[PDB]
From a paper:
The two genome segments code for four viral proteins, the nucleoprotein (NP), the glycoprotein-precursor, the small matrix protein Z and the large > 200 kDa L protein which harbors the viral RNA-dependent RNA polymerase. The L protein synthesizes two distinct RNA species: (i) the antigenomic and genomic RNA as products of genome replication and (ii) the shorter capped viral mRNAs during transcription. To initiate viral transcription, the L protein presumably uses a process called cap-snatching. It is assumed that the L protein cleaves host cell mRNAs downstream of the 5'-cap structure and uses this short capped RNA as a primer for viral mRNA synthesis. Here we present the crystal structures of the two terminal domains of the CASV L protein: the cap-snatching endonuclease in the N-terminus and the 326 C-terminal residues, which, by analogy to LASV, might play a role in transcription.
Therefore, we expressed and purified the first 205 residues of the CASV L protein as N-terminally His-tagged protein. As expected from the metal-dependent enzymatic mechanism of viral endonucleases, thermal stability assays showed a concentration dependent stabilization of the protein by manganese ions with an increase in melting temperature of up to ~10°C at a concentration of 10 mM manganese (protein concentration in the assay 4.2 μM). After His-tag cleavage, the protein was crystallized and the crystals diffracted to a resolution of 1.9 Å. The native protein crystallized in space group P212121 with four molecules per asymmetric unit. The structures of the four molecules are very similar with the only difference in the C-terminal 15 residues, which are not visible in all molecules (RMSD between 0.227 and 0.317 Å). The CASV endonuclease has basically the same fold as endonucleases from LASV, Pichinde virus (PICV), and lymphocytic choriomeningitis virus (LCMV) even though the amino acid sequence of this protein is hardly conserved among these viruses (identity ranging between 20 and 55% and similarity ranging between 54 and 79%). Slight differences between the structures were observed in the long α-helix parallel to the β-sheet (α-helix shown in orange), which is separated into two helices in CASV endonuclease domain compared to the other structures, as well as in the helical region shown in green, which is composed of four to six helices of different length and orientation. The highly conserved residues of the endonuclease active site are positioned as in other arenavirus endonuclease structures. We also tested for endonuclease activity using our previously established RNA cleavage assay, however, we did not observe enzymatic activity of the isolated domain.
Author numbering:
A (entry chain D): 1 to 197
B (entry chain B): 0 to 205
C (entry chain C): 1 to 193
D (entry chain A): 0 to 199
The structure:
């Protein structure tokens, strides 16, 4: 297992030199399992960050809630359901609030189910902001691969490959990762579109 | 200048994770003061979640499976629900019952009420669907003034809060790491501890 | 010194996440020498715990003596030599007592000498218990490496490697560890495969 | 609930280690009441050993070398002995004499006699073997009602005992940390504590 964590550590460190904002969530620990899980979260966080850049919105790394987003646009409003969006912006000029939900899923049928589950969180919110005089655009993205942006795809591939390598090697991985998440990542690796890499 | 507080907070976190090692997989110990402060704040919340789960006899959801995945483990065929990640859950197939837990700390009772309302509102419609299938779906929502400490000494929960706030209060550059609301909530939480705890020297383990 | 001790602290936490009962003897202090000595004791304790698991007996972390063990089985008995076994069990239904002495030594010749010294502690005890119709089974284990059980060997190696690195760093170590134990640990590390 | 006891016991141990810094290597200060209570109880026994060794002019065996190792240092060749770790030792090479010390505390004289017997019995055969190799072997065995406190005020030793027992008496979670037999021995020492030496 020794070569895999050492390379994964260097992969993570190289990604941070390209996108230093990811330092807030990264880890370079020696524990191979903890390092693998942080690489998996980093993969998802890279996708979010690049979706936020492409949309010109704030990456919600401080994890403020939908209620707190709306607070910065309309101080008085009913208490909505608890939601933490991946990204948001408040356009005071245009009286518009944008929220983003971004994910990766290897198969199109899972992307559609993920998109649905994410959209369902927001029931009723647009109606309330409709009445209270604001535009509320919910953007929901679920794509086959994480958007790499400035990060070479080679590095995102190695996040996936090395983490699964670490996690497949042993029994005790099941304390760290659900069968669902492991299966989704393994499918993304086995069906990886290598044409781009 | 932040080094003494940062070195002490590392020792607090190390001691807590020695006492309750189930938390190790959800935590982290780094030398960066702001990153360490945020890990301490997350650990405070995770300790609360853990002990609420223990007190209720349910699973602490550290793998962060969603509501849809919980229901998959009870009823293979079901419509897609909203995306929710509960703090804890259990599936009692004997009693055809699912329990989900939402746990939080909020220092002021009016904030506790709004938090409880926001958390329970995530689950709109779910109970009806499960009762339609003959199942019980019990949503337990707890919001308390202080974190439940369980086996962790309360002084260490306190030090997570005081040392992280001391680090974050040195320069408002920490605003990039923590929101105004969370920072203010933690400041309010600090004022609910007694004067002796707030002012006494703490030296950690030796 | 801080790279080694920072790593050693996280090695200790990882081990505790797998075997939480080792918290009774663990340390995560900042003093590198105290931390290294604690990691050396943890190494031996892991071996004890896993030997106890393999034998199905109680790891004696409360350090009850042989006289105390026999008091629990046979209330009236002559005073025996003071011994604290690494593990024990009392099977009252079958009138059987088991005690364990577990250790590591790098050289097979030193394993045999260690086994002999641990066995010799118990002279006369089995004869007294057998005279009352009890069995008294003394299990003595001295192996090249700690039994790691559920703990990855990686972590047991790091306990040894990082502790010795800290301790070889200065003759400050002389206040913390005897030449005999340091030499034996250095043997275990230099011959570690 | 255990917080006042824990806070005070932490400071008691800190004060003791200020007085006898050598104890720092052997002791621990933590914030967990149970682990701190066991540290305090172990420290109480270690203070007794330290002062017995000092009072007799012998080495406190803090690195826990075995009897075989002690004899290895004095005599090149010898049979493997039983494993023993004395509380203290001294090798007087010029007078070809080895001294070992076993020190303990027990509340009752009858238990002191039994403990003395159990410690002496560890050493069966050793004196005779060493006589054959030209060496004198003296075994000193001490079991007293209170720990010898030396530089440490007895009030601090009393607090080690009282506060650790207060913590451990609270609940059954203590059964993970201490045997019933050791708890009873310590509680006996507290209930029959002779306060006349605390007055003086």
């Amino acid at each position: 297992m020794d070569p895999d964590t050492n390379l994964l550590k260097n992969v993570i460190l190289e990604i941070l030199s390209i996108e230093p904002d990811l330092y807030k969530q990264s880890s370079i620990v020696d524990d191979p399992y903890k390092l693998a899980m942080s690489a998996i979260r980093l993969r998802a966080t890279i996708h979010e960050l690049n979706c936020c850049r492409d949309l010109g919105i704030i990456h919600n790394t401080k994890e403020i809630s939908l209620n707190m987003v709306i607070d910065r646009a309309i101080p008085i409003h009913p208490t909505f359901q608890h939601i933490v969006p991946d990204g948001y912006t408040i356009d005071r000029a245009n009286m518009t609030i944008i929220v983003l939900e971004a994910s990766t899923r290897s198969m199109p049928s899972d992307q559609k189910r993920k998109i649905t589950s994410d959209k369902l969180k927001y029931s009723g919110v647009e109606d309330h902001l409709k009445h209270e005089g604001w535009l509320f655009n919910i953007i929901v993205i679920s794509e086959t691969k994480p958007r790499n942006g400035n990060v070479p795809e080679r590095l995102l591939f190695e996040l996936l490959k090395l983490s699964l390598s670490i996690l497949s090697y042993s029994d005790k991985s099941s304390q760290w990762i659900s069968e669902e998440e492991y299966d989704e990542l393994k499918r993304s690796l086995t069906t990886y579109d290598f044409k781009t890499l």
